[PDB]
Write a protein that binds this ligand. Structure first.
Ligand SMILES: Cc1cc(C2=NC(=O)N=C(c3ccccc3)C2)ccc1O
Length: 344
């Protein structure tokens, strides 16, 4: 059948051009940005995703610059990239990953069931690890939502993706406030703040968690006004102090709504506590990605005996690097459990 052979630049290694052949090119996503194809590498027979985007010669592609410097087991890896036509197109060859949290959470949803807590723990933890990692380089995803969380059903491994909105956030510089999707935007973004920090990613992550527990989005609405009301129903009315810290220079005064009332009965208290600590009005009061990994809701993953429902072992969860722990090294004493310290 058809066989394409291109010369590509490795994702991270030194610029030693590679010859890459692949066939079976079917489409797997469309969007303002461009297209994403699934393809099968001729040699190894491995599947890959190729993300074709328009290359605006005027500048260097920011998605590319950010992806080239990332290397983490919970982030889709960029293998090689190459330019071409279809009038200049940039093509990113990334690892192929079967499902997405969006799809998975949906199969349980239109079946009146919820994703087994053990999976919520595994997936949420890996998301937080990936955030702790990119945040250490000063990079903010800015579009954390279920659809950008890829999953391998079998291994229970999660990989963050879509860095098309990602950006190095330098304190003092302003950034557009129209990033991030409907249900997952942090309050300060809705209020149009221009000086937001990486915490917006934590708020998004919090919405993902809450969603996996509830079986539906926690803060829906077709408009900002509607989303704010849903937020206020749960967190209550923001004191002026908080409205201030969200920055932007007047709503149905409602009070504290105990989060246990929010989740199904039987929801673990720890899950509820972790939410309350992520979904906070004041951006600086939210846990950091690393602090979240060390939260008690994840203690079960730190148990020597824990196994996946299908009997296999849990993925690599403690191979932390100094880079990852840099936001707060002392945490390592919790993030890396004893049995992970046994030498032999
Ligand atoms: C299956 C798979 C998908 C992706 C996507 N990356 C992206 O930036 N954007 C994606 C997208 C898909 C549909 C519509 C819009 C964006 C998909 C990366 C690696 C993979 O292994």
């Amino acid at each position: 059948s058809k066989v394409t052979t291109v010369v590509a630049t490795p994702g991270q290694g030194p610029d030693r051009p590679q010859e890459v052949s692949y066939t079976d090119t079917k489409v797997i996503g469309n969007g303002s940005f461009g297209v994403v194809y699934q393809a099968k590498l001729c040699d190894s027979g491995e599947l890959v995703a190729i993300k074709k985007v328009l290359q605006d010669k005027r500048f260097k592609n920011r998605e590319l610059q950010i992806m080239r410097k990332l290397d983490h087991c919970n982030i889709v890896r960029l293998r090689y990239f190459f330019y071409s036509s279809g009038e200049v197109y940039l093509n990113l060859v990334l690892d192929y990953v079967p499902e997405t949290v969006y799809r998975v959470a949906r199969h349980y949803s239109r079946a009146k069931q919820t994703l087994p807590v053990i999976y919520v723990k595994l997936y949420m933890y890996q998301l937080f690890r990936s955030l702790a990692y990119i945040h250490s380089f000063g990079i903010c995803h800015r579009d954390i939502k279920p659809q950008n969380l890829l999953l391998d059903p079998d291994t229970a491994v999660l990989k963050l993706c879509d860095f098309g909105s990602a950006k190095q956030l330098v304190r003092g510089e302003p950034n557009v406030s129209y990033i991030c999707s409907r249900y997952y935007r942090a309050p300060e973004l809705i209020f149009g703040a221009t000086d937001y920090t990486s915490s917006i990613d934590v708020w998004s992550a919090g919405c993902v968690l809450a969603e996996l527990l509830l079986g539906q989005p926690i803060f829906p609405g077709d408009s900002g006004v509607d989303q704010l009301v849903e937020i206020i129903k749960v967190l209550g009315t923001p004191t002026r102090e908080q409205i201030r810290e969200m920055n932007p220079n007047k709503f149905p005064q409602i009070k504290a709504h105990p989060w246990t009332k929010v989740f199904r009965p039987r929801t673990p208290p720890e899950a509820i506590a972790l939410c309350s600590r992520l979904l906070e009005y004041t951006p600086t009061a939210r846990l950091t990605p690393l602090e979240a990994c060390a939260h008690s809701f994840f203690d079960e993953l730190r148990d020597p005996n824990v196994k996946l429902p299908n009997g296999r072992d849990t993925p690599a969860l403690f191979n932390f690097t100094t880079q990852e722990l840099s936001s707060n090294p002392p945490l390592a004493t919790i993030l890396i459990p004893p049995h992970a310290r046994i030498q032999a």
